[PDB]
Swiss-Prot record:
Section covered of the full-length record: 45 to 56 of 63
Site (Reactive bond): 4-5
Superkingdom classification of source: Bacteria
Lineage of the organism: Bacteria, Pseudomonadati, Pseudomonadota, Gammaproteobacteria, Alteromonadales
Organism: Alteromonas sp. (strain B-10-31)
Name this polypeptide is given: Marinostatin-C1
Length: 12
């Protein structure tokens, strides 16, 4: 399943 991390899982 895709993460809902901060800012995004693989942006910064």
């Amino acid at each position: 399943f895709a993460t809902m991390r901060y800012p995004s899982d693989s942006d910064e």
